[PDB]
Chain length 274, copies 4
């Protein structure tokens, strides 16, 4: 496979539906040696089996808000794996209230929480593991259109993702000198533990399905394969990029109508509402 | 005014609803000395009165597909005005068929026409008048979101506008050395002779009205004022820019819902649709 | 003038070279009634005379890190001015260390400071004064190309500005319903108290001067005029926009060479370098 | 392999250094069945042996300026291959003069040639072969940063590439309904027959090498692998995207300096310039 002999750290798995899992799964089918981290002991209940399923005995605790965990992590992968060829950063969080209502109502606390867990953790994760990164290593994080466009009540996470993509660009210049790559995979809406916690997500999901050029929502496998590519040597010439895996949704300047042209009607007015 | 003493050429007026007219109107209110061009004698019937209305006796014939017209134009403005401080390029065309159906169906002839009238003409207009341009001169052209985003059946005009905005960047580097500025005003949908010729434009218009942040379509005056700004010394520090005057529509990543949050419903499903 | 009768709050004046002063100066020349805020008593020494210079007796204390100041600000402008037509948000801070070295070295504390002072403050400032904002009101903030592109050691401030422009988009949708506008002016490098504190800024400045299409650095007046425009009714059709006032620098995909074409040489290898 | 059993048409091979060959090579290593086209009999001298090297006996003549060639192409692939899974569009042309001097000097003829051969050909190629495209088929074309940013004397080809990326977006919507994907690979500068014909290309090449984050130019293999990915089911969730394979160069907002920070000096002033 394209990751045969390669060692990578997967941060962000919560269950078999996690985007991090889709990527880990695809990276595994490519021969990668994987190691996983979990936020707490409850999540570990799902991460461990998943790890074993992917031939991995390396499971470490990691709550990006606890700096001491980063210390242990360094020592852990350095002892178990010795070095890393790729890092998957699939983590983000903001209080439930922040994701509803307007950005205006956001509290200073919710803001900092969103930024620290969703943005700064990439810096700390990368800086902490930099010594263990081999040449050609690849760092991947996840983003969403909400960083550069308005998306229904994405609010503060929108500011976080925009900062995150900027961080991807600066990190690429900081680590590129060492031949290390950094990119962001901008996935289209998909059902996950975090997404199921978002208001009217079924609607955001329905909207993408109908208005996206490929007229369908992206699968966990498609996001996973896209991540695996970004992480492999297949994309050794790619860095600082925000790669879209959203069935082409990002290209839409408005609602689709294309199929019907009698008087041209919104695909939305025809399907998933009437 | 901000254009007092300044001399500009207005290319693109077809009637009192033309964007070029809005711009000319706003520039006039700022003390600008104006000159106008018309495609043919039928359009001249509307351009002349408008020109007189704006205290202008300089009306020249100009069909961008006829190179000889550019020769006469140079001689005309050089004799009547001696020099130009700003140029407004508000012209575009493509066969009716091209704007309906898909891009795939576009013929080679419709493609070339769209590109020559909507893009090359800016090059030839600018190159032809370059010797008559004073320092600080400002060249302005019009574009639409369809250049960088998909908009319903905009098809070939989308490729043209994209090229046009790229031309704006190259022309800014070419003329910037001579202290001349070049920009593109990306207007939101608005009723005009050319727009009225487009299929289901009422819908594209309705859609922008409901989904745009300011919840309304832009007025001709707002587009005009924006243009005047771009043309005046007020923006002497701006060049190679694509300025959006679309009630903020360009920031939308999807349909609006913001106002209603019970279950959060698409503002489209509530207004202009039910 | 275009701001005659209009009332604006200027946040960010440190001295006669602050971008906020340029904007205030330009807005003043347009008949605007102004009110200013200062971070502390040392800054107030410069803010007051400036305020008087601009015919303003409304000077308030405002350190965006102290929530109680926002309460007093509300009560103050509400008592002195009654309502606001525009808000100028020209504030940003980050520890000196963050702006040097790599992003990777940034501490969690510096990160939060950068984000809170430079981004969250726009949210709190706007939310606090929302009730005093009249219809058609305009909120303006300042950004830099470092948000979407890598700029020498801009680091964390780059992430901040990316988030800021994203905030401008979400705030525009939140406030657009109330006919209020929100934009960001992306100014080119310019000598200010804050800029003078940045390493090798003379170089970033020199580089923009030689490589920018208009071959020069932007003047405080140009930035001020651009701001005034964004804040006036002249731009009532503009919102959620990131307006570039950088002598067109943003369009450069590489170093300039355009003038000399023998073998084509980098303008940088010819000027300010030999 | 990821293209095992998949059938694709490679358009644009001139020799063993052509980007189309790098992609064909990578697609071949993935089990794809290939078919090639050549402009004329002189090019065929290089295409055939290459085709045989890639286990391909399907070599067809195709000059995108001759419509009748598209007719023959349809009949040829339909008889030899029956159907297509992916199309590679790696073709562009502009008179030598256009690529030097300014855009302002471009003639109407050079403009049309640049647009027709570099942009319209994708439309015609795709429309002609649409009936032979299986579901999940992928259409790939090549672009360059010069489409959205100014690149030294890229001129009219910059307008063309901008239009080409816009076309990719519209074609993605037109063909997405049929589950077909359309993308654009934006390669970094690389030595090819066409590039060798461009003025001071060694400099543009040198400039990317030193200023790109990965501090190196991209290899033909890297571009090939990126293309193969875009053409394979690995990217089934990607469409209408402009994928950058330029060692991360696109993220640079100015010349690099990062490594040296004493006073921070442009890497350009240190290497390939002294
Ligand atoms: N070389 C680079 O650094 C670079 C960078 C970005 C994009 N590209 C793009 O890659 C594509 C081609 O790649 P390349 O650099 O390998 O060029 P190349 O010289 O290897 O071949 C591309 C050419 O297109 C073909 N062509 C020209 N006119 C044609 C016509 N009328 N009909 C059919 N074919 C025609 C030529 O035969 C030749 O194969 C172009 O779109 C080019 O703009 C190249
Ligand atoms: N689901 C989508 O449609 C979608 C779309 C775009 C982007 N994303 C991004 O993908 C990533 C999440 O993936 P997902 O959607 O599979 O959701 P998920 O729930 O599976 O993943 C979120 C992960 O973040 C972890 N996390 C939360 N707080 C943490 C903390 N303090 N320390 C360490 N880990 C913490 C959770 O434990 C969980 O494993 C996020 O970055 C998200 O923004 C998701
Ligand atoms: N109406 C909108 O919602 C909208 C939105 C975005 C951009 N635009 C742009 O604005 C410009 C047109 O403004 P408008 O909407 O007022 O349309 P309009 O009909 O009022 O103006 C179009 C002008 O172009 C002229 N023209 C066409 N072919 C010509 C030729 N061969 N030679 C000389 N002139 C020629 C017409 O005579 C007409 O005066 C176009 O470039 C268009 O793409 C319009
Ligand atoms: N100078 C440039 O070349 C340049 C370029 C692009 C953008 N900008 C932006 O312009 C804005 C400021 O303009 P400037 O460059 O003239 O800087 P400036 O020094 O004149 O203003 C910065 C202001 O921020 C204020 N500030 C800092 N911390 C504060 C706090 N906690 N509470 C309240 N106020 C606080 C300072 O008091 C000062 O008035 C910044 O947002 C900056 O990022 C500057
Ligand atoms: O970024 C996302 C974008 C989408 Cl469309 C769906 C889910 C996402 O992921 C998260 C992660 C944590 C929190 Cl609190 C909220 C959303
Ligand atoms: O560019 C435009 C965008 C919009 Cl929304 C509405 C009208 C426009 O202008 C034209 C000009 C000529 C032709 Cl043939 C078609 C459209
Ligand atoms: O954003 C900026 C961009 C440039 Cl080019 C120059 C100065 C800027 O403003 C600041 C404000 C506060 C800190 Cl701590 C650092 C920089
Ligand atoms: O697009 C390109 C970009 C670069 Cl950097 C180098 C070569 C390129 O390809 C071409 C193809 C045909 C002509 Cl006439 C000119 C350039």
């Amino acid at each position: 496979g394209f990751l045969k002999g390669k060692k990578g750290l997967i941060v962000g798995v919560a269950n078999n539906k996690s985007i991090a899992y889709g990527i880990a799964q695809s990276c595994f089918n490519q021969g990668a040696t994987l190691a996983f981290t979990y936020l707490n002991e409850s999540l570990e209940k799902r991460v461990r089996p998943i790890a074993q399923e992917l031939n991995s005995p390396y499971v470490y605790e990691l709550d990006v808000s606890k700096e001491e965990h980063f210390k242990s992590l360094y020592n852990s992968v350095k002892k178990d794996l010795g070095s890393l060829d790729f890092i998957v950063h699939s983590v983000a969080f903001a209080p439930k209230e922040a994701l509803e209502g307007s950005l205006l109502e956001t509290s200073k606390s919710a803001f900092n929480t969103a930024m620290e867990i969703s943005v700064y953790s990439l810096i700390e994760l990368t800086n902490t593991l930099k010594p263990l990164l081999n040449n050609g290593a690849s760092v991947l994080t996840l983003s969403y259109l909400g960083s550069t466009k308005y998306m229904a009540h994405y609010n503060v996470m929108g500011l976080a993702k925009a900062a995150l993509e900027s961080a991807v660009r600066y990190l690429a210049v900081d680590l590129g000198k060492h031949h290390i790559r950094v990119n962001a995979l901008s996935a289209g809406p998909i059902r996950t533990l975090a997404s199921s916690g978002i208001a009217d997500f079924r609607m955001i999901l329905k909207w993408n399905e109908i208005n996206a050029p490929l007229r369908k929502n992206v699968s966990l496998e498609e996001v996973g394969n896209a991540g695996m590519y970004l992480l492999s040597s297949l994309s050794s010439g790619v860095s600082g990029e925000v790669h879209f895996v959203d069935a082409g949704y990002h290209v839409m300047g408005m609602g689709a109508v294309e199929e019907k042209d009698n008087k041209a009607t919104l695909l939305w007015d025809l399907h998933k509402e009437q």
